[PDB]
């Protein structure tokens, strides 16, 4: 995470 | 993406410096009898693998007629490197970029995107990443010129890695790969490299890495995890699961520990997913069958972007 | 430093990925009739030109017998990139590294060095950089195994740039340089490149850049200035002033403004000295005599290390 | 500055 992407 | 000779020619634009990244053997940290090769995607111009995806979206969508500079607006929800790469290349190429992310994200994340002139839309903290995803969809639904970058589904993502990342690895390893390991975020890197290797006749085993705390490929429940850059909580349409020989789960704390050991042992300075990929590579390299074999993995992003994160929090009290 | 084929081979250690950096034409930001080439030293493994100096100190001092791994202790006073590069390469190579700097320096500066395991000694804030310099000297005087990296005087600094940076530029520009411009910190980059160019028979003009607020080469008084990485407040022993055709002063605010314009126009993301060098290059490129000529300058460091600094403070209120 | 170098 976060979406982290 | 035709091989462009960088150490020897002058580029016309910074996007020619994307990809064609170095490869490095893991040394001190590798105590096994297998060779471990790191594909150094941290060395891309904006410091992560997503520079390849960004370029493929602009270049390919423009060539197909889907993106028109000065008119198309590129939208994506991202609190990580895909936003960065889209904001960097959209600035140069004459596209307005809108990135959505929750308001509770760090100043560093918002600031880097605003430096390249992207519009950052901050969505309510209590709605999490889903609120940012919903806002990006709403923008694209409402505006005929707005298009989603669509990182988890775009056909451009696995393709760019089949056309560039994989053939680079093949050349650098002298056509000798026994195992390719990579954490799956969008799945583009693993899918595109696995395709390239298979077409070249490689019998490499293909291994997907995911967080132990969000073991979705394995069959478990999505959940929150530490390993920024992978583990999306769903199976992305980009990923071709038929190519995978093994899903290996790595715990967030093993990824963190490995990242810090790598900086001191080998001088490789990366994020959480580079520590997960190396932890995985070292696990496979311990298997007795891998003696004298070549395992290739990826260092997806450079460490400096993580100074403000949890990743290096231990360094303080050491 | 023998040409090593990176896009095509696997390195044995990350120090083989230092230097052999790309070169990039300035595009949107260049509205003149001259060509401006940026030598992209921001693309070194630890994101600045000082990676070349770091490597030259370890490699050359070891080969001369002056540094002995596991015994020699490398000391330097630095709140900038020389500390970073010394801490990174000392970790890998088995040297204890001590970097001194004032206690009022940012957490980011201390943290990056501690990640690579360097000892950071913080000196009293009211004594400034002189207090840190004095502490490094005291350590080297007291301890027979401690040696100063000596960045402003070491013979290794101009040499590495004569052996690598300059010949790279010469190959990349197809043996065609009319002007080489670089801000002087230690002076190694300008000195070593100017030597290489002259030995190759180039009639390039050599132009040193310094801060308008610390115009020491020009003949003015040292003073505090904004342009991190240059303007040491004295003439470094490394610098060979006999090679310089022109000292061009650039104001700290012109450097700052240029850095931000460069990110949006060309996608080049750099520190204050890259904005000074480009501001200078654009000034020379405006001179009518430079029509159709090639001006080469340097982007010394990548921008991400400056997010916490003054450099991009404007982005907030935009 | 700082020494900055
Ligand atoms: Na639309
Ligand atoms: Na000594």
Distance C85 CA to ligand 2 centre (A): 21
Q: Which C positions 200-259 lie with beta carbon below 8 A of chain B?
A: none
Instruction: Identify the residue among B48, B76, B78 best suited for mutation to test binding to A, counting A beta carbons within 10 A and taking the highest.
Output: B78
Map residue B240 onto helix, strand or coil.
coil
**How far is the C-alpha of C194 from the C-alpha of C32, rounded, in Å?**
24
CA C247 → CA C122, C158, C181, C229, distances in Å? 34, 18, 9, 17
**Residues B35, B290: Cα–Cα separation, whole Å:** 9
Q: How far is the CA of C145 from the centre of ligand 2 (A)?
A: 6
CA-to-CA distance for B193 and B172, rounded, in angstroms? 13
Q: 3-class DSSP state for residue C103?
A: coil
Phi, psi of B147, rounded to the nearest 5 degrees: -130, 140
Catalytic residue among B48, B85, B273, B301: B273
C82 labelled ligand-binding: no
> DSSP state, B202?
-
Three-class DSSP labels, C288-311: HHHCCCEEEEECCEEHHHHCCCHH
Q: Is B78 annotated as a binding residue?
A: no
Q: Closest residue of A to B234, CA-based? A: A3
Collect residues with CB below 5 Å from ion ligand 1.
B 140, 146
Domain boundaries, chain C: 1-49+151-318, 51-150
Q: From CA B269, how far away is CA C103, in angstroms rounded?
A: 25
Residue of B41, B38, B61 whose CA lies nearest to B50? B41
Q: Is B50 a catalytic residue?
A: yes
Q: Would you say C290 and C32 are in contact if contact means Cβ atoms under 8 Å apart?
A: yes
* Selected residue of B13, B21, B24 to mutate for chain C interface (largest C Cβ count, 10 A): B24
Q: Name the 3-class secondary structure at B266.
A: helix
Residues of A in contact with B80 (CB under 8 A): 2-5
H or E element that contains B120: strand B119-123
CATH topology of domain C51-150: Rossmann fold (3.40.50)
- Say how far apart CA C309 and CA B144 lie, in whole Å: 39
Residues B101, B80: contact at Cβ < 8 Å? no
Taking the CA of B148 as reference, the closest ligand is 1
| Nearest CA-CA distance, residue D2 and chain C, Å | 6
Q: Residue C100's beta-bridge partner residues?
A: C77, C121
Contact C177, C199 (CB under 8 A): no
Nearest CA in chain B to C308: B108
Q: Entry resolution in angstroms?
A: 1.7
Alpha-helix runs per DSSP H in C64-206: 81-93, 107-115, 128-142, 155-160, 166-172, 188-199
Residue C66's φ and ψ, nearest 5 degrees, are -80, -30
Q: Are B131 and B124 in contact (CB under 8 A)?
A: yes
Chains adjacent to D (≥3 CB pairs closer than 8 angstroms): C
Ligand number nearest to the C-alpha of C137: 2
Closest residue in chain A to residue B128, using alpha carbons only: A2
Measured between beta carbons, the chain D residues lying within 8 angstroms of C129 are 1-3
Rounded CA-CA distance C130/C152 in Å is: 14
Instruction: Say how far apart CA B273 and CA B133 lie, in whole Å.
Output: 22
β strands within chain C, DSSP E = 10-11, 23-25, 35-39, 73-77, 96-102, 119-123, 146-148, 179-183, 205-211, 246-250, 294-298
Spatial CB neighbours of B288, under 8 Å, sequence gap ≥ 6:
none
Pick the CATH number of B1-49+151-318 from 3.30.750.24, 3.40.50.1100, 3.40.50.740, 3.60.140.10: 3.40.50.1100
> Which strands form C119-123's sheet, in the order they lie side by side?
C119-123, C96-102, C73-77, C146-148
Dihedrals phi, psi of B49, to nearest 5 degrees = -55, -30
Six-digit token string for B4: 């462009």
On whether the CB atoms of residues C12 and C261 are closer than 8 A, the answer is: no
Q: How far apart are CA C179 and CA C290, in angstroms?
A: 9
Nearest chain B residue (CA) to A1? B228
D2: chain C residues, CB-CB within 8 Å: 79-80, 101-102, 105, 129, 228
Interface of C with D in 148-177 (CB under 8 A): 151
B231 reaches A (C-beta below 8 A): yes
The 10 Å Cβ neighbour count of residue B289 is: 8
C54 known ligand binder? no
Give B15's contacts in chain C (Cβ within 8 Å). 267
d(CA C86, CA C75): 9
CA angle B14/B20/B23 to nearest 5° reads 135
The Cα–Cα gap between C285 and C36 comes to 8
- Catalogue the active-site residues of C: 50, 273
The CA distance from C148 to C61, in Å, is 11
How many CA atoms lie less than 13 Å away from C176 in the CB half-sphere?
11
C106 labeled binding residue: no
Which technique? X-ray
Chain C CB within 8 Å of residue B95 CB: no
How many Å apart are CA B260 and CA B150, to the nearest integer? 32
Helices B81-93, B107-115: crossing angle, 10 deg rounding: 20
The answer to whether B260 touches B315, Cβ cutoff 8 Å, is yes
**In the annotation, is B273 catalytic?**
yes
Q: Which of B50, B96, B226, B293 is catalytic?
A: B50
Contact state of B151 with A2 under an 8 Å Cβ cutoff: no
Residue B315 DSSP code:
G
Please report which ligand is nearest the Cα atom of C144.
2
The helix (run of H) or strand (run of E) holding residue B94 is none
Check if B1-49+151-318 and B51-150 are the same fold: yes
Distance from CA of B96 to the nearest CA of A (A): 20
């Amino acid at each position: 995470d976060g979406s982290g992407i | 993406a035709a091989p462009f000779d960088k150490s020897k020619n002058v580029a016309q634009s910074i996007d020619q410096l994307i990809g064609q990244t170095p490869a490095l053997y893991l040394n001190k940290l590798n105590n096994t009898k297998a060779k471990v090769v790191l594909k150094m995607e941290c060395e891309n111009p904006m410091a992560s693998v997503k520079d390849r995806l960004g370029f493929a979206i602009y270049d390919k969508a423009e060539k197909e007629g889907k993106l028109i500079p000065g008119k198309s607006i590129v939208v994506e929800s991202s609190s990580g490197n895909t936003g960065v790469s889209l904001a960097h290349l959209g600035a140069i190429r004459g596209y307005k970029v809108i990135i959505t992310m929750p308001e509770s994200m760090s100043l560093e994340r918002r600031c880097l995107l605003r430096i390249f002139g992207a519009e950052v839309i901050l969505t309510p903290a209590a709605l999490g990443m889903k609120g940012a995803v919903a806002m990006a969809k709403k923008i694209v639904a409402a505006n005929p010129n707005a298009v989603l970058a669509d990182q988890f589904a775009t056909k451009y993502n696995a393709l760019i890695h089949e056309e560039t990342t994989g053939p680079e690895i093949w050349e650098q390893t002298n056509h000798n790969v026994d195992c390719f390991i990579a954490g799956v975020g969008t799945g583009g890197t693993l899918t595109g490299v696995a395709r390239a290797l298979k077409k070249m006749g490689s019998h490499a085993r293909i291994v997907a890495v995911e967080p132990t705390e969000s073991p979705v490929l394995s069959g478990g429940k999505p959940g929150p995890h530490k390993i920024q850059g992978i583990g999306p909580g769903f199976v992305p349409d980009v990923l071709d699961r038929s190519l995978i020989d093994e899903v290996l789960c790595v715990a967030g704390d093993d990824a963190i520990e490995t990242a810090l050991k790598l900086t001191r042992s080998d001088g490789v300075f990366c994020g959480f997913s580079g520590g997960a990929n190396v932890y995985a590579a070292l696990k496979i390299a311990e298997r007795p069958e891998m003696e004298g074999k070549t395992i290739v993995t990826v260092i997806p992003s450079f460490g400096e972007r993580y100074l403000s994160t949890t990743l290096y929090r231990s360094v303080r009290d050491e």
